[PDB]
Amino acid sequence: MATLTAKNLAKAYKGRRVVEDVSLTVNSGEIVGLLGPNGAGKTTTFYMVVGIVPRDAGNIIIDDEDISLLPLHARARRGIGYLPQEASIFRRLSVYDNLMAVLQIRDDLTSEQREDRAKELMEEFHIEHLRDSLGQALSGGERRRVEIARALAANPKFILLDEPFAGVDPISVIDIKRIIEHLRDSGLGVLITDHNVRETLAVCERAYIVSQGHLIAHGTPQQILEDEQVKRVYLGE
Amino acid sequence: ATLTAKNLAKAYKGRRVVEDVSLTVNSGEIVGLLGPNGAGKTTTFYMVVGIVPRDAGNIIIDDEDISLLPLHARARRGIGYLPQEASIFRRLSVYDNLMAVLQIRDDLTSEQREDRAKELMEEFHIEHLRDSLGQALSGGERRRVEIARALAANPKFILLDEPFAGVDPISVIDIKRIIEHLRDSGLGVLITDHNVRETLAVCERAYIVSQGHLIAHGTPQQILEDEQVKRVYLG
Amino acid sequence: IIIRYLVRETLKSQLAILFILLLIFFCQKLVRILGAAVDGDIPTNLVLSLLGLGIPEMAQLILPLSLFLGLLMTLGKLYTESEITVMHACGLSKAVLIKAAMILAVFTGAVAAVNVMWAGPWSSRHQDEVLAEAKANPGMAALAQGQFQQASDGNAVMFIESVNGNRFHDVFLAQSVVVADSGELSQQQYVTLNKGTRFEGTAMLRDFRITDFNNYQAIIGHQAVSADTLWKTHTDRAAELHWRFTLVATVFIMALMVVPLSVVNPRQGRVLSMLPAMLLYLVFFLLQTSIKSNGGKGKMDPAIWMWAINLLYFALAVLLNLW
Amino acid sequence: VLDRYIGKTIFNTIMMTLFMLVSLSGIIKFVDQLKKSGQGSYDALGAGLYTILSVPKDIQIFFPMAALLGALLGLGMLAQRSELVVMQASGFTRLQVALAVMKTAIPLVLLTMAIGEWVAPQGEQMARNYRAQQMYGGSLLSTQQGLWAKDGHNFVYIERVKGNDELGGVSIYAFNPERRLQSVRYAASAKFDSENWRLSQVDESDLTDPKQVTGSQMVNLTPDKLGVVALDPDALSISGLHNYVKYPGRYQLNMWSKIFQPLSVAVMMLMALSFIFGPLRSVPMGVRVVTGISFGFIFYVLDQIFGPLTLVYGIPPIIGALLPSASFFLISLWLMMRKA
Ligand SMILES: [Pt+2]
Ligand SMILES: [Pt+2]
């Protein structure tokens, strides 16, 4: 039931206005997309919502509390989850080890309840057979489910996902799109910024589209495809 | 002209990235080598290019064998490898970048070669970028300089590695039109890009390989309806 | 327990680059020992033993550098793999890697302490020695061969032009001269020179000694000895313990300084981002070596510029960490 | 058009590395200058061993290092930008690339011999001759040291040598064909006049026979500046070393170790190709620079360590210089004959 809202957001690198006046909203248990042309709006405005790229104008709110000050550091404590595109699995750390070593960081859980949450995360994502196996010794889909389960071991809502559709294999995207909807089912927010609109708008409830810096489109994907000005700069069906 | 490949195979650490693949591409006919990630599609393309050495393969042009000949030899014949990224010669002018390739061409006379540079400029609409270097070029205007520069090597076959590399749907139609422009001339293009929707939007025929072996071949409609690829690739 | 992962990586790198740095330093130490073997006219028997004599002297720079660069490489390589930015994406503190660095900095700071209280003065004891039985007593191992042999202070100077040690020439010695033809030498030690002439006529009126072809000996081989301000209850201070304790202080300063110098720049240039972080260490160590000049040890005490820049640099070490 | 592009890209990065490496030793050969400052100068000797001593840094040390790291990193950026595969996918040979890298070699080795034989001992000697504000040492200066000699089979000692061409002391031991003293000469100042060394206040104490104790008080091939070698530096011209070679071999190494410098610069460039065509496998700037910085030191070791290490057997300097610098090329030809 928590809410993640960005108001009057803007940024400029050295002189060039990367992103101008733009505002967005994402509530718990849904899929919200952030698309647009290359570099123009998307990805650059996404890391401001994540907390990496600094804020120049506006404010970011979580659970009706201010976070525009808070960087990538302690944003994850209330409800911020981040999954980068790049293979960020812990190399010389076993599946059970890297999951628990980041779960024991969260003090709001019992010493043996962390083991009970680990074996629960072993069944929810089916990683039980990999418990002992070391990191980076897993396949694309295998590493993917470890990254999601590990990042969730802090109870965060609004799972911000950078380019979740990297390995563009039309068979592989179906299961990745299905677990994204499972995060929606568990009542957690889902933010996506992937290039491929055909698989993002296929899972999205409402997606924001940002061009040149200023917000131009929002709502159901059917309203986006039907929109004339979004065809003028991004799709053109 | 034609370009053939017969019983192509390569092994890494015993993994065997390719196990007996055979594909042909004719002058005018634009084929597409597709398939899953690392399944074969990737290495098969570079084996045909000449980067990856064949372990059991056979690379033939129209009739002339090249499976033993390297990249710099195949290029002088009529092969045109185009990488996914820039490589437009940053510290070189567009005209000089075009002329540097024409320098190698011995079939063109001292003036006739300078004439092809002017010819490619007006062809790929880059005459406005004559004295300009190459350090900064828009996605559309950069790619047409690369193809022009590649064409300066007198090609028969043009192997386009991932031509839709992070290109927005508004710009894919322009990049797709270059392939359709080259198709109009006696060139046989070979695409290998991940966005199947756009690769099968241009290609007449398409070869699809899994675990190293060819499984699907034909027109886009013949692939889409095929039971094997609908479970291992298409979904 | 993510700290355990961080320290496992630094042990894999620091204790590997330490082996590599030993070799680079070994080579430069072998250059100067080879240099003294020709220009300085020092024997060949103590060449390899002097190489080992300088290993605790070498460790002064390799130990604070290995923990610095080991941490620079690991944090940098884990930063690129996105493990460092994903450690922070799933809660955690920037202090996690400061904690990891400082928890493995005590491991190295203890070895630097052994290299200061025990290994530091042991080398100084054998460096005052330079092996007296070989330096003060030059024998067959000394071998002049086609060139001079300056000894004591300007006066003693031998000059030979021999075949192997059977047929010598010139001799000279000076210490006012002595020139001999044939000659031999065999240690236990006597210089059995055949044909020759002696001299000691300083003035026209002053005496002059002479000789001829006899087997002279002069059985000489006097094994010379070592001759032939520290703690102080009160806050004495300042006399080289300003440096002797600073090389143990450097183990902890560079550990804190480089933590945010490896996770804020490699987004640009993977190895070019190491350059600003590395350059800092260089200037720091170039100035600490330079402060160790205005009256070194004992009587003349160095003014607090060594500890002044050690704090000016610690202020710099906390500065970036608060960002 | 492409020929000059390879030649430029590789050359400019060698000048980038030359100015990059020499500047670091330059900022270092200024802080050791403030370690030995407060004798008569600080800024005069500060720049007297910085702008003056900048020229003998290159040729003697950081020229083959820039002819490798710079040549390797020059192709390393071309390979990273993947312009190198385009040259090939155009029809430009692997050998055509090697031709242009070695085409820039010859005008660059020309540069090594020119400012290595002429401007290098110039900036070397003048930097040591400017060390007159700071006393205690050799050169035309003298404090608590006695200058020795040998004029064939003859011998000479000087108590103190001065810049005024006068020698405060002098003692020529004129020897006979059997090496028996015939003069114990002493001059307050034995000056030099065009061809002869002026013998002021002669004391030719003859001993032609053991009885012969003739004491003649009155008033040959004696070297003037040809004798002034200073604190025995070896770092001077190939010409200046050769004449001295006729006048026992530590000087002989350096006259060969100075003529290997032009070939080593070319060999390093041949090895940069042996590495850019050998270990290529899309390796990043990091791995390309670490072996670029290591192989420079590997080759510094074979010069500074294995070079003097030829004193052991007393193996001629040709084998001690023109061969450990050719061993570099022996790995180079091996790399190019294994992969290709
Ligand atoms: Pt076909
Ligand atoms: Pt680079």
Author numbering:
A (entry chain B): 1 to 237
B (entry chain A): 2 to 236
C (entry chain F): 2 to 176, 186 to 198, 203 to 242, 253 to 262, 264 to 348
D (entry chain G): 6 to 201, 204 to 226, 233 to 260, 268 to 360
What sentences appear in the manuscript?
The structure was determined to a resolution of 3.7 Ångström (Å) by the single-wavelength anomalous dispersion (SAD) using data sets collected at 1.0723 Å, and the sequence register was validated using sulfur anomalous data and selenomethionine anomalous data. LptF and LptG each contain six α-helical transmembrane segments, namely TM1-6-F and TM1-6-G, respectively, a periplasmic β-jellyroll domain, three periplasmic loops, and a pair of cytoplasmic turns. LptF and LptG form a hetero-dimeric cavity with a total of 12 TM segments and the two LptB copies form a homo-dimer in a “V” shape at the cytoplasmic face of the TMDs region. The IM section of the internal cavity is very hydrophobic, while the section above the IM is highly positively charged. There is an extra electron density in the cavity that could not be assigned with any confidence. The highly conserved residues K34 (TM1G) and R136 (TM3G) of LptG are found at the upper cavity of the transporter and around this extra electron density. The periplasmic domains of LptF and LptG adopt β-jellyroll folds, which together comprise 10 β-strands in a manner that resembles the periplasmic β-jellyroll domain of LptC.
The asymmetric outer membrane (OM) comprises phospholipids in the inner leaflet and lipopolysaccharide (LPS) in the outer leaflet and is essential for Gram-negative bacteria. To understand the structural basis of how ABC transporter LptB2FG extracts and transports LPS, we have solved the crystal structure of the LptB2FG complex from Klebsiella pneumoniae.
